[PDB]
Amino acid sequence: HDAQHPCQANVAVRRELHTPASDRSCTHLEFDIAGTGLTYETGDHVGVYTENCPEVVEEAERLLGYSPDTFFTIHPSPITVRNALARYADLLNSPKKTSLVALATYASDPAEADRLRFLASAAGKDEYAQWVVASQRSLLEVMAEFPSAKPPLGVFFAAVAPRLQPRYYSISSSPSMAATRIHVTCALVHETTPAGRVHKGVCSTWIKNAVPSEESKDCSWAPIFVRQSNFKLPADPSVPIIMIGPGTGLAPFRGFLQERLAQKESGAELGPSVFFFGCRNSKMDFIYEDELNNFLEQGALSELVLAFSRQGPTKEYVQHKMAQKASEIWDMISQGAYIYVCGDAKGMARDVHRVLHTIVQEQGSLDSSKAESFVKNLQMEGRYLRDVW
Numbered sequence: 001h002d003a004q005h006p007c008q009a010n011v012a013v014r015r016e017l018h019t020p021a022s023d024r025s026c027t028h029l030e031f032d033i034a035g036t037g038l039t040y041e042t043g044d045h046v047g048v049y050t051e052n053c054p055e056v057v058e059e060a061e062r063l064l065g066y067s068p069d070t071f072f073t074i075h076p077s078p079i080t081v082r083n084a085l086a087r088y089a090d091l092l093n094s095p096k097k098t099s100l101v102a103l104a105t106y107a108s109d110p111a112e113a114d115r116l117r118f119l120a121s122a123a124g125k126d127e128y129a130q131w132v133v134a135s136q137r138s139l140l141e142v143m144a145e146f147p148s149a150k151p152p153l154g155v156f157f158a159a160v161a162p163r164l165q166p167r168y169y170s171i172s173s174s175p176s177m178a179a180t181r182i183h184v185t186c187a188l189v190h191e192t193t194p195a196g197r198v199h200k201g202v203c204s205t206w207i208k209n210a211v212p213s214e215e216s217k218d219c220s221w222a223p224i225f226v227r228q229s230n231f232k233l234p235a236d237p238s239v240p241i242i243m244i245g246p247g248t249g250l251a252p253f254r255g256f257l258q259e260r261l262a263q264k265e266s267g268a269e270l271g272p273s274v275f276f277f278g279c280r281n282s283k284m285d286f287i288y289e290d291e292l293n294n295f296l297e298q299g300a301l302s303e304l305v306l307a308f309s310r311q312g313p314t315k316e317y318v319q320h321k322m323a324q325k326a327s328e329i330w331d332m333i334s335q336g337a338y339i340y341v342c343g344d345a346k347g348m349a350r351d352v353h354r355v356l357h358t359i360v361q362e363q364g365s366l367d368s369s370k371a372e373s374f375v376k377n378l379q380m381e382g383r384y385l386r387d388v389w
């Protein structure tokens with residue numbers, strides 16, 4: 001197989017991970033790779049191809065004016081407009097400037113065409129940055145703003161809408177525990193753009209609503225593929241590890257705990273392992289709670305320190321639980337520990353990154369530049385891994 005060009009894989013199980021008391025959602029999904037050439041390793045990513053929501057496809061058909069019963073060859077052999085808009089057109093992301101140039105070329109209203117060309121010009125870079133990018137206006141909202149821009153079928157797919165990208169997920173299973181299934185842990189995305197558009201995450205919604213073979217024969221399926229990563233466990237189990245990913249950052253570590261549990265059903269000494277997990281509330285989004293405690297019953301995990309974002313008077317996060325445990329994690333580093341970080345890259349990672357910078361000082365007696373350059377060397381050594389998005 002080839003990673004980029006997918007394998008028609010089937011969804012076997014699809015389950016909600018949060019309690020009904022929770023007001024968010026996170027899905028546990030398993031792809032069935034039996035009878036396929038797909039192989040994966042612990043810590044790898046699975047790329048998933050999806051399709052647009054039907055209402056989004058409808059709005060595009062309204063704006064474009066094509067006959068959805070038109071067959072054409074997208075540079076499936078021939079495909080209808082509706083299915084090309086569903087599976088191959090990114091409709092909700094913001095149009096690039098070259099896409100605006102193409103819209104203007106077909107805008108029959110002088111004022112609208114002038115405004116489109118302006119938005120793509122250097123003189124318009126400031127208005128483009130605010131009205132398109134900062135407001136997260138979709139291509140569909142731009143086209144409604146300029147209803148005279150009617151590009152032909154070929155131009156639209158070649159220059160106006162880019163391809164619907166696959167969404168990547170850090171596999172949450174180990175091949176030793178399930179070489180027939182690729183597990184994913186996918187949080188539902190549902191936000192409101194600054195300009196007020198209700199956006200449903202394209203892939204996370206398709207995963208949340210997918211029909212599993214465990215509940216019906218007429219079950220969902222997706223073209224999937226595996227991407228090799230460097231988010232890997234050390235060579236031998238004696239090496240201690242530190243895992244920090246909260247929320248969906250738990251994903252790869254579930255395979256991490258499955259991999260080492262499988263090996264040491266027949267392997268070697270456990271070696272210290274500590275999992276820093278965080279979530280909103282033990283009654284809401286403590287995903288995989290039972291499975292986590294089972295890993296602690298056996299020798300997989302050794303200590304699971306928890307941070308609760310909205311359970312109690314003190315709002316805690318994984319980095320707050322790290323500074324309290326700053327004494328033992330330093331000991332772990334001198335014992336040669338690998339440190340893993342997975343999950344949100346904008347805040348959690350930045351805060352976790354700048355909290356072990358500050359505890360390698362107090363517990364290391366280095367100043368800033370010496371603590372900074374030291375942490376950098378842990379990365380170059382390959383002992384400080386980050387799988388963030």
Ligand SMILES: Cc1cc2nc3c(=O)[nH]c(=O)nc-3n(C[C@H](O)[C@H](O)[C@H](O)COP(=O)(O)OP(=O)(O)OC[C@H]3O[C@@H](n4cnc5c(N)ncnc54)[C@H](O)[C@@H]3O)c2cc1C
Nearest residue numbers: 093094136168169170185186187191201202203204251389
């Ligand atoms: C290596 C890797 C591993 C990952 N692992 C996981 C995992 O284990 N679990 C998991 O849940 N996720 C994971 N992700 C993230 C995941 O790939 C998706 O990004 C996420 O699920 C949302 O996909 P979606 O299709 O639902 O979102 P999209 O529909 O792509 O939405 C993406 C975001 O863009 C915003 N947006 C909407 N409109 C616009 C616009 N016009 N311009 C700009 N932004 C806009 C949306 O509000 C939304 O927040 C991973 C990502 C990477 C790179």
